[PDB]
Amino acid sequence: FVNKDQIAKDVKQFYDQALQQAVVDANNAKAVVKTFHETLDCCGSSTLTALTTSVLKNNLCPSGSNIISNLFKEDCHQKIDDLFSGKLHHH
Amino acid sequence: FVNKDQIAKDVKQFYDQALQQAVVDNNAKAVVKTFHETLDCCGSSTLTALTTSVLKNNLCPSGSNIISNLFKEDCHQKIDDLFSGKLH
Amino acid sequence: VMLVESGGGFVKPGGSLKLSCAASGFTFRSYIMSWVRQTPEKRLEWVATISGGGGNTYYPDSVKGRFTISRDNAKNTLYLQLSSLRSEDTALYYCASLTAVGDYWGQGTSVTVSSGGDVVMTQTPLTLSVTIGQPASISCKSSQSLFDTDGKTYLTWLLQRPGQSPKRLIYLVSKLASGVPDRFTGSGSGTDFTLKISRVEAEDLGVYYCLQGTHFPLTFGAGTKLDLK
Amino acid sequence: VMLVESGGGFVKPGGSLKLSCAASGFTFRSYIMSWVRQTPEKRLEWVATISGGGGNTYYPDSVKGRFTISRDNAKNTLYLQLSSLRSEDTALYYCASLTAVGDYWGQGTSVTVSSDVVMTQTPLTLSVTIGQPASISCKSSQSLFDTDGKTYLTWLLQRPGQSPKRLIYLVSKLASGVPDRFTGSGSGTDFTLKISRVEAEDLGVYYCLQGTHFPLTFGAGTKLDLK
């Protein structure tokens, strides 16, 4: 059996790793970041202050969806916790 | 730390365990719908019988299915493409 | 905006070709793509479908094992490997995002197999000859109900204008597609369906087909040719 | 369909109150939710914004450190804890999905405390007759043109008795349930709402809103009035 919290944690680590690597140029880190941000509809994490501020700055969060402001963002860690706890679907 | 391959495989296994329970019996249904919705997919090639049972429970709410509901993205492939960074 | 097929040809029975289709102008990687073939007698037949990511492939029994549909999303290309070809495979092979939200068709690439060099959809009449301005009505009946557990009724009407590829006209029985003028009306339910044209214009001439997408395999009516008296 | 606010009231300088907003009829958890206050003089001010999942909270400096936005997704409730309250915190506080794809507003709950891009709008009041054309200007102190290449200029209209409602977003794009008598135009710092022929449900206060620069700011408003 694979435990919810163990994979959620591993998924946030994977993502935090790619976020780091992305901000030191590693064109693949950037692809992973863009993928996570588009598929999960998120941008950075509040838990990752230093990395999140380097990242907006890198224009790795398009909006598209955003029609009023692009100032406000979902936290990817929270999106990952909610994916594994089955809380992302529009019921 | 984290190797792309073991995580992708862990996620698939977690998805697969929820897809199974969701059929034979929920938090499992909630997880399955979240995965289908978030990843834009429905069941898996590797689980054809499970996958044919999805419509019976409305685990794969269509919306974009306007010509047929027979054809689906495979969740396993969506999982690999998430970690490979191909879904943008 | 664009799908462009190539790779067809003249091949001997038992032979092999590989068709390709270069896509541009839409988000290919996220498009469930199909091949659809048009026979010398102008029947449309579904040949193959592949998911956005390429993990699910679908084939009707007539081609299963012989044809392989694939795609290379990085190159924005769709492929069809043909093998053990036989004479009934001779057709114009179209690339199309047949079941996707956007309706896009290539222009077909031909395969002619020659040593010389399921739900039934019933479309009547076979040809309806008309006068400009006069109204039209075409029938299409299925041998099983098209009403899915789903709640949706996957009946589609398409039109192929002379010298063009087929074009989705209406889906889910009654809903018009992009840019279809209001003088088209689709009705029906269960196993009975009708396409009515208020007032035929010259842009309406060609072959209409219905398509059911409720039951595997996808099937088409044999076609009604609308032309002038 | 519904946002219902409560918990407003009357308080002394330096006191506390906690406001609530009960949502229903949309997928609450996936909306970035806001509080927007409207002062006795009918100015709108952005107060706080929280992400769908609760992780990112945002505040202008005027309330930052004093107010805490929060949300309970399982209960479909949005909160604003008010503390160290000041006279100028007196206003009607609106729960709203201000920046979300759907535009929902509560009806507002009132607080009375009692012992940046400048947005300009010309004219301050337009009096008009039904069927007359109308033209309101909104001017900003910096370009609202984002790196996005989007221009986050938004028009809202508050009808007498009514909470505010989105009418135009991204300069020119009409919101839902909005007729074509409405037309927004402009670029840079200069923006214009034209009503071709004013009907009687065009009357109220018009506000522009920029979303390009932190913090979110509102023009002081133009009153549409007949006569």
Side-chain angles (χ1 to χ4, degrees), chain A residues 1-13 80-82 84-85, chain B residues 7 10 14 17:
Chain A
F1 194 88
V2 20
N3 162 266
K4 179 222 322 214
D5 299 313
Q6 165 256 320
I7 345 100
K9 180 89 178 160
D10 295 341
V11 181
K12 300 182 268 193
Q13 221 49 81
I80 291 166
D81 290 334
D82 290 343
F84 293 101
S85 62
Chain B
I7 196 200
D10 276 358
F14 175 90
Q17 58 214 26

PDB file of all heavy atoms in Angstrom, chain A residues 1-13 80-82 84-85, chain B residues 7 10 14 17:
ATOM      1  N   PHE A   1       0.854  -1.225   0.000  1.00  0.00           N
ATOM      2  CA  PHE A   1       0.000   0.000   0.000  1.00  0.00           C
ATOM      3  C   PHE A   1       0.882   1.264   0.000  1.00  0.00           C
ATOM      4  O   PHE A   1       2.015   1.282   0.533  1.00  0.00           O
ATOM      5  CB  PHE A   1      -0.952  -0.036   1.203  1.00  0.00           C
ATOM      6  CG  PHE A   1      -2.100   0.966   1.144  1.00  0.00           C
ATOM      7  CD1 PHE A   1      -3.309   0.639   0.510  1.00  0.00           C
ATOM      8  CD2 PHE A   1      -2.002   2.211   1.793  1.00  0.00           C
ATOM      9  CE1 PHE A   1      -4.388   1.554   0.485  1.00  0.00           C
ATOM     10  CE2 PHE A   1      -3.075   3.142   1.769  1.00  0.00           C
ATOM     11  CZ  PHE A   1      -4.270   2.809   1.114  1.00  0.00           C
ATOM     12  N   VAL A   2       0.387   2.318  -0.637  1.00  0.00           N
ATOM     13  CA  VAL A   2       1.121   3.577  -0.651  1.00  0.00           C
ATOM     14  C   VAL A   2       0.239   4.590   0.060  1.00  0.00           C
ATOM     15  O   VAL A   2      -0.990   4.691  -0.189  1.00  0.00           O
ATOM     16  CB  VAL A   2       1.562   4.022  -2.068  1.00  0.00           C
ATOM     17  CG1 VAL A   2       0.752   3.334  -3.078  1.00  0.00           C
ATOM     18  CG2 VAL A   2       1.426   5.531  -2.259  1.00  0.00           C
ATOM     19  N   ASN A   3       0.878   5.316   0.964  1.00  0.00           N
ATOM     20  CA  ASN A   3       0.192   6.146   1.894  1.00  0.00           C
ATOM     21  C   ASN A   3       0.042   7.563   1.291  1.00  0.00           C
ATOM     22  O   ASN A   3       0.997   8.078   0.689  1.00  0.00           O
ATOM     23  CB  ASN A   3       1.048   6.120   3.163  1.00  0.00           C
ATOM     24  CG  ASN A   3       0.743   7.211   4.051  1.00  0.00           C
ATOM     25  OD1 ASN A   3       1.386   8.241   3.989  1.00  0.00           O
ATOM     26  ND2 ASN A   3      -0.321   7.054   4.859  1.00  0.00           N
ATOM     27  N   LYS A   4      -1.139   8.182   1.468  1.00  0.00           N
ATOM     28  CA  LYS A   4      -1.427   9.538   1.004  1.00  0.00           C
ATOM     29  C   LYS A   4      -0.377  10.559   1.366  1.00  0.00           C
ATOM     30  O   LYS A   4       0.047  11.362   0.533  1.00  0.00           O
ATOM     31  CB  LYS A   4      -2.774  10.014   1.584  1.00  0.00           C
ATOM     32  CG  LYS A   4      -3.234  11.470   1.192  1.00  0.00           C
ATOM     33  CD  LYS A   4      -3.858  12.347   2.317  1.00  0.00           C
ATOM     34  CE  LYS A   4      -4.751  11.614   3.307  1.00  0.00           C
ATOM     35  NZ  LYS A   4      -5.900  12.497   3.786  1.00  0.00           N
ATOM     36  N   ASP A   5       0.017  10.578   2.633  1.00  0.00           N
ATOM     37  CA  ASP A   5       0.909  11.612   3.152  1.00  0.00           C
ATOM     38  C   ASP A   5       2.313  11.395   2.673  1.00  0.00           C
ATOM     39  O   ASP A   5       3.020  12.330   2.354  1.00  0.00           O
ATOM     40  CB  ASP A   5       0.851  11.652   4.684  1.00  0.00           C
ATOM     41  CG  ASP A   5      -0.569  11.995   5.220  1.00  0.00           C
ATOM     42  OD1 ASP A   5      -1.203  12.956   4.718  1.00  0.00           O
ATOM     43  OD2 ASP A   5      -1.072  11.290   6.135  1.00  0.00           O
ATOM     44  N   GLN A   6       2.737  10.157   2.588  1.00  0.00           N
ATOM     45  CA  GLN A   6       4.046   9.905   2.042  1.00  0.00           C
ATOM     46  C   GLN A   6       4.170  10.414   0.590  1.00  0.00           C
ATOM     47  O   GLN A   6       5.210  11.028   0.270  1.00  0.00           O
ATOM     48  CB  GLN A   6       4.439   8.416   2.130  1.00  0.00           C
ATOM     49  CG  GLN A   6       5.648   8.079   1.217  1.00  0.00           C
ATOM     50  CD  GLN A   6       5.218   7.325  -0.076  1.00  0.00           C
ATOM     51  OE1 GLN A   6       4.343   6.442  -0.025  1.00  0.00           O
ATOM     52  NE2 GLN A   6       5.847   7.663  -1.226  1.00  0.00           N
ATOM     53  N   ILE A   7       3.162  10.161  -0.287  1.00  0.00           N
ATOM     54  CA  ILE A   7       3.336  10.575  -1.708  1.00  0.00           C
ATOM     55  C   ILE A   7       3.151  12.048  -1.845  1.00  0.00           C
ATOM     56  O   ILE A   7       3.882  12.650  -2.617  1.00  0.00           O
ATOM     57  CB  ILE A   7       2.458   9.889  -2.865  1.00  0.00           C
ATOM     58  CG1 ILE A   7       1.773   8.634  -2.445  1.00  0.00           C
ATOM     59  CG2 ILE A   7       3.311   9.653  -4.151  1.00  0.00           C
ATOM     60  CD1 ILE A   7       0.347   8.935  -2.130  1.00  0.00           C
ATOM     61  N   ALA A   8       2.177  12.622  -1.132  1.00  0.00           N
ATOM     62  CA  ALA A   8       2.034  14.090  -1.121  1.00  0.00           C
ATOM     63  C   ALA A   8       3.346  14.769  -0.774  1.00  0.00           C
ATOM     64  O   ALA A   8       3.801  15.696  -1.474  1.00  0.00           O
ATOM     65  CB  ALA A   8       0.999  14.527  -0.117  1.00  0.00           C
ATOM     66  N   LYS A   9       3.966  14.292   0.312  1.00  0.00           N
ATOM     67  CA  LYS A   9       5.259  14.838   0.704  1.00  0.00           C
ATOM     68  C   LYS A   9       6.288  14.654  -0.402  1.00  0.00           C
ATOM     69  O   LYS A   9       6.956  15.601  -0.787  1.00  0.00           O
ATOM     70  CB  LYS A   9       5.744  14.232   2.042  1.00  0.00           C
ATOM     71  CG  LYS A   9       7.111  14.788   2.495  1.00  0.00           C
ATOM     72  CD  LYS A   9       6.931  16.033   3.346  1.00  0.00           C
ATOM     73  CE  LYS A   9       8.334  16.537   3.842  1.00  0.00           C
ATOM     74  NZ  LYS A   9       8.268  18.000   4.254  1.00  0.00           N
ATOM     75  N   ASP A  10       6.400  13.453  -0.946  1.00  0.00           N
ATOM     76  CA  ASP A  10       7.349  13.235  -2.068  1.00  0.00           C
ATOM     77  C   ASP A  10       7.043  14.093  -3.281  1.00  0.00           C
ATOM     78  O   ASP A  10       7.954  14.600  -3.941  1.00  0.00           O
ATOM     79  CB  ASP A  10       7.410  11.749  -2.444  1.00  0.00           C
ATOM     80  CG  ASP A  10       7.997  10.889  -1.315  1.00  0.00           C
ATOM     81  OD1 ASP A  10       8.665  11.452  -0.419  1.00  0.00           O
ATOM     82  OD2 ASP A  10       7.784   9.665  -1.300  1.00  0.00           O
ATOM     83  N   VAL A  11       5.758  14.306  -3.557  1.00  0.00           N
ATOM     84  CA  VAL A  11       5.411  15.187  -4.676  1.00  0.00           C
ATOM     85  C   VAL A  11       5.791  16.656  -4.470  1.00  0.00           C
ATOM     86  O   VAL A  11       6.359  17.281  -5.396  1.00  0.00           O
ATOM     87  CB  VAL A  11       3.928  14.972  -5.207  1.00  0.00           C
ATOM     88  CG1 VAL A  11       3.633  15.902  -6.387  1.00  0.00           C
ATOM     89  CG2 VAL A  11       3.802  13.510  -5.639  1.00  0.00           C
ATOM     90  N   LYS A  12       5.555  17.192  -3.265  1.00  0.00           N
ATOM     91  CA  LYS A  12       6.007  18.580  -2.978  1.00  0.00           C
ATOM     92  C   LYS A  12       7.567  18.728  -3.056  1.00  0.00           C
ATOM     93  O   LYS A  12       8.083  19.752  -3.562  1.00  0.00           O
ATOM     94  CB  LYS A  12       5.448  19.062  -1.641  1.00  0.00           C
ATOM     95  CG  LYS A  12       3.902  19.065  -1.604  1.00  0.00           C
ATOM     96  CD  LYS A  12       3.373  19.585  -0.297  1.00  0.00           C
ATOM     97  CE  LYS A  12       3.149  18.507   0.680  1.00  0.00           C
ATOM     98  NZ  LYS A  12       2.341  18.996   1.855  1.00  0.00           N
ATOM     99  N   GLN A  13       8.291  17.676  -2.637  1.00  0.00           N
ATOM    100  CA  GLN A  13       9.755  17.692  -2.670  1.00  0.00           C
ATOM    101  C   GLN A  13      10.199  17.727  -4.120  1.00  0.00           C
ATOM    102  O   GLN A  13      11.001  18.572  -4.489  1.00  0.00           O
ATOM    103  CB  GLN A  13      10.357  16.476  -1.927  1.00  0.00           C
ATOM    104  CG  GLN A  13      11.610  16.788  -1.046  1.00  0.00           C
ATOM    105  CD  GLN A  13      11.401  18.011  -0.093  1.00  0.00           C
ATOM    106  OE1 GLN A  13      10.794  17.901   1.005  1.00  0.00           O
ATOM    107  NE2 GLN A  13      11.888  19.190  -0.536  1.00  0.00           N
ATOM    108  N   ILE A  80      -1.160  20.262  -4.348  1.00  0.00           N
ATOM    109  CA  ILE A  80      -0.708  18.869  -4.287  1.00  0.00           C
ATOM    110  C   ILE A  80      -1.369  18.140  -3.116  1.00  0.00           C
ATOM    111  O   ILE A  80      -1.774  17.016  -3.291  1.00  0.00           O
ATOM    112  CB  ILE A  80       0.807  18.745  -4.169  1.00  0.00           C
ATOM    113  CG1 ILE A  80       1.454  19.187  -5.464  1.00  0.00           C
ATOM    114  CG2 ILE A  80       1.197  17.284  -3.837  1.00  0.00           C
ATOM    115  CD1 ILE A  80       3.007  19.425  -5.355  1.00  0.00           C
ATOM    116  N   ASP A  81      -1.518  18.770  -1.941  1.00  0.00           N
ATOM    117  CA  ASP A  81      -2.195  18.104  -0.798  1.00  0.00           C
ATOM    118  C   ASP A  81      -3.615  17.837  -1.182  1.00  0.00           C
ATOM    119  O   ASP A  81      -4.144  16.768  -0.875  1.00  0.00           O
ATOM    120  CB  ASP A  81      -2.241  18.921   0.536  1.00  0.00           C
ATOM    121  CG  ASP A  81      -0.868  19.063   1.230  1.00  0.00           C
ATOM    122  OD1 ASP A  81       0.018  18.222   1.043  1.00  0.00           O
ATOM    123  OD2 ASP A  81      -0.669  20.059   1.990  1.00  0.00           O
ATOM    124  N   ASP A  82      -4.250  18.804  -1.839  1.00  0.00           N
ATOM    125  CA  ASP A  82      -5.651  18.601  -2.188  1.00  0.00           C
ATOM    126  C   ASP A  82      -5.874  17.573  -3.336  1.00  0.00           C
ATOM    127  O   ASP A  82      -6.972  17.043  -3.446  1.00  0.00           O
ATOM    128  CB  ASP A  82      -6.360  19.928  -2.535  1.00  0.00           C
ATOM    129  CG  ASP A  82      -6.569  20.853  -1.303  1.00  0.00           C
ATOM    130  OD1 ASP A  82      -6.481  20.383  -0.146  1.00  0.00           O
ATOM    131  OD2 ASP A  82      -6.810  22.081  -1.516  1.00  0.00           O
ATOM    132  N   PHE A  84      -4.204  14.684  -3.657  1.00  0.00           N
ATOM    133  CA  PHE A  84      -4.189  13.360  -3.029  1.00  0.00           C
ATOM    134  C   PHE A  84      -5.239  13.190  -2.017  1.00  0.00           C
ATOM    135  O   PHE A  84      -5.542  12.058  -1.660  1.00  0.00           O
ATOM    136  CB  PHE A  84      -2.859  13.046  -2.426  1.00  0.00           C
ATOM    137  CG  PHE A  84      -1.793  12.886  -3.477  1.00  0.00           C
ATOM    138  CD1 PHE A  84      -0.907  13.905  -3.733  1.00  0.00           C
ATOM    139  CD2 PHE A  84      -1.727  11.698  -4.245  1.00  0.00           C
ATOM    140  CE1 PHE A  84       0.052  13.774  -4.743  1.00  0.00           C
ATOM    141  CE2 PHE A  84      -0.805  11.566  -5.240  1.00  0.00           C
ATOM    142  CZ  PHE A  84       0.094  12.589  -5.513  1.00  0.00           C
ATOM    143  N   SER A  85      -5.844  14.282  -1.530  1.00  0.00           N
ATOM    144  CA  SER A  85      -6.904  13.998  -0.593  1.00  0.00           C
ATOM    145  C   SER A  85      -8.234  14.125  -1.271  1.00  0.00           C
ATOM    146  O   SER A  85      -9.291  14.129  -0.645  1.00  0.00           O
ATOM    147  CB  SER A  85      -6.748  14.731   0.726  1.00  0.00           C
ATOM    148  OG  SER A  85      -6.797  16.074   0.493  1.00  0.00           O
TER     149      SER A  85
ATOM    150  N   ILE B   7       8.547   8.207  -7.812  1.00  0.00           N
ATOM    151  CA  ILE B   7       7.363   8.973  -7.482  1.00  0.00           C
ATOM    152  C   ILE B   7       6.184   8.740  -8.464  1.00  0.00           C
ATOM    153  O   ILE B   7       5.057   8.420  -8.034  1.00  0.00           O
ATOM    154  CB  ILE B   7       7.703  10.483  -7.165  1.00  0.00           C
ATOM    155  CG1 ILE B   7       6.531  11.121  -6.458  1.00  0.00           C
ATOM    156  CG2 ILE B   7       7.995  11.286  -8.410  1.00  0.00           C
ATOM    157  CD1 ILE B   7       6.565  12.633  -6.551  1.00  0.00           C
ATOM    158  N   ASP B  10       4.753   5.502  -7.623  1.00  0.00           N
ATOM    159  CA  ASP B  10       3.966   5.650  -6.375  1.00  0.00           C
ATOM    160  C   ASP B  10       2.568   6.287  -6.611  1.00  0.00           C
ATOM    161  O   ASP B  10       1.524   5.812  -6.099  1.00  0.00           O
ATOM    162  CB  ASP B  10       4.766   6.509  -5.344  1.00  0.00           C
ATOM    163  CG  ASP B  10       5.786   5.678  -4.515  1.00  0.00           C
ATOM    164  OD1 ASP B  10       5.835   4.443  -4.732  1.00  0.00           O
ATOM    165  OD2 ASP B  10       6.523   6.275  -3.644  1.00  0.00           O
ATOM    166  N   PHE B  14      -1.020   4.744  -6.205  1.00  0.00           N
ATOM    167  CA  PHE B  14      -2.044   5.388  -5.371  1.00  0.00           C
ATOM    168  C   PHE B  14      -3.333   5.628  -6.144  1.00  0.00           C
ATOM    169  O   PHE B  14      -4.419   5.408  -5.648  1.00  0.00           O
ATOM    170  CB  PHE B  14      -1.505   6.722  -4.841  1.00  0.00           C
ATOM    171  CG  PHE B  14      -2.518   7.521  -4.064  1.00  0.00           C
ATOM    172  CD1 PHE B  14      -2.636   7.356  -2.675  1.00  0.00           C
ATOM    173  CD2 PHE B  14      -3.308   8.488  -4.714  1.00  0.00           C
ATOM    174  CE1 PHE B  14      -3.594   8.115  -1.923  1.00  0.00           C
ATOM    175  CE2 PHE B  14      -4.253   9.276  -3.989  1.00  0.00           C
ATOM    176  CZ  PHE B  14      -4.411   9.077  -2.576  1.00  0.00           C
ATOM    177  N   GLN B  17      -4.906   2.111  -6.615  1.00  0.00           N
ATOM    178  CA  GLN B  17      -5.661   1.646  -5.439  1.00  0.00           C
ATOM    179  C   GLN B  17      -6.981   2.386  -5.249  1.00  0.00           C
ATOM    180  O   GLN B  17      -7.976   1.739  -5.007  1.00  0.00           O
ATOM    181  CB  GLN B  17      -4.828   1.443  -4.158  1.00  0.00           C
ATOM    182  CG  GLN B  17      -4.080   2.635  -3.651  1.00  0.00           C
ATOM    183  CD  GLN B  17      -2.718   2.307  -2.971  1.00  0.00           C
ATOM    184  OE1 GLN B  17      -2.072   1.275  -3.250  1.00  0.00           O
ATOM    185  NE2 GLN B  17      -2.280   3.211  -2.086  1.00  0.00           N
TER     186      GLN B  17
END
